[model samples]
Target: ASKYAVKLKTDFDNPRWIKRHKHMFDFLDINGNGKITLDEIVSKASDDICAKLEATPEQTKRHQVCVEAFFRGCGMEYGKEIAFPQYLDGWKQLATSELKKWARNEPTLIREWGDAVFDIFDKDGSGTITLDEWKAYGKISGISPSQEDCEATFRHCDLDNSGDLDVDEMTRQHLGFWYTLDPEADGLYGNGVP
Candidate 1:
């Protein structure tokens, strides 16, 4: 019914977002403590990512690469193994220095932009965003999201089904989206302006 419907369909082609966010709970609960601890999640993800990439903890470069790749593959069934190369290519394709500089110079601006974008995607006004809501919003925004694209974006961001994005999930999705737009822009992070 909305003018944005067609665009939304074209943009939100991925479904993995929900599955990935949900999986984070299990991935971080490495000790099976029935709850996610800061160390379990942050440290464990970093470690698990590094291990999957076959990089040592001390290798910061490889660690970053592995983590990026891990996030890329986060929601998909085969993400853990296949995401690294994609992440690597994504990073290499960008103006990494300029992006890092922008982050250093205008953290608040970027954060606000991210929040605004997320708010735009959270169409239901329910404080949490579901994949359906996002697809609808994207359509209204004129993206023409395809099913595959929506599914990929969803898998990348919706780590848990709380229908709301936490900081990390928001950041990942935001950055991923920006990168999808320019792949060549130094300051571009996630899916942007498209």
Candidate 2:
């Protein structure tokens, strides 16, 4: 078994597991419409994974296959169809398990990874990323982002734009954005934590 499988077995039964899954649900409801469709869920998940892994547009086919695999795996683990909460739980277990495996290999805060992520998003050297920039960037990573899509994405993240995001703004936006991608890991942040 992979190292991640071992870590997953250790924490599979935790009661707080549901909290972790919440992030995934939040991610799928991209429009904040409260109902998640396969398109919204799959598109956001694909974009996020691509961005995190820095996959290029040329690599989209492979990236798409991977996202489908995740959805399929989730279906098998829980049921044929996953409600928001159940989907969230499955995603959390899977992501946390992978993180733990990486930690075992080389324990690190991993905050730098987040920093790099923000840097990538903040295009045009503006120190703040607009929705259009983010969408364009997402497209580079193989996700199809339309102008309308960018508008919605920006509305969700930019509370008081100032043309850039400070740390707090960034965190709020990041948490919201990350939750959409993986709602099951809500507890990943806590008081006094980034």
Candidate 3:
């Protein structure tokens, strides 16, 4: 496991980290229904967005598996809605297990989960994701975030200020979204970190 994962085993207990976890759960419950469903979990890679982005069936399926891995990893059964309390409970266990795998340098699923998600927005098969691409992807993904929200998140993840995000930047932010104990840091989930 990397140093970050090694420490998160202990850091995950922080109140601020728990708070962010709560916020992340809410964000995933796109309908604000206090429960997350399979539909919501796979919404970002739904057929509509896949069509818009011209994602291959293979790419779309890969993204779906990645998204569902998070849902299933949280102990939620397929076809059932997971309420906040259940989600939180499951998340703690899931995080602990993944942290250990990361620490051992094992081949964790998160290794490619970030890229799976990022590629859906990297239209033209570009190596980077531009702000304009993200905005369109965000809108099509059904959360219907405001332009300001999209821009804020895109800028936050674009570590180099190079007007786009490459795989490394996206992956680091994605990893930090889980390993980070600092509540103030912006996570990949848009509004979750702070």
Better of 1 and 3 by TM-score: 3
Give the alpha carbon lDDT tens digit for every residue of 70-177 in model 3: 667877655688887777777777777777887787765565677786787777777888877775333555434432466776776676688998876666656666
lDDT of 1 by residue, 60-113 (tens): 344444443433332212213223334333333332432454445634223443
Error of 3 at 134 (Å): 4.2
lDDT over C-alpha atoms for residue 194 of model 2: 18
Worst 10 residues of 1 by lDDT: 1-10
Give the candidates in order of lDDT, highest first. Answer: 3, 2, 1
Runs of candidate 3 exceeding 4 Å displacement: 1-10, 13-15, 27-34, 44-54, 130-144, 147-164, 181-184, 187-194
Which residue window of length 10 is worst by lDDT in model 3? 1-10
TM agreement with the true structure for every prediction: 0.32, 0.38, 0.69
Task: Give the per-residue lDDT digits (tens) of candidate 2, residues 1-194.
Answer: 11122222234434444444454455456677654555665566555656665655745455455455555544432223446656655655545644564447643122223344455555565776665555432333332332224554445445564554443444444433332332422222331111
**Pairs that collide, model 3:** 1-102, 1-103, 1-104, 1-105
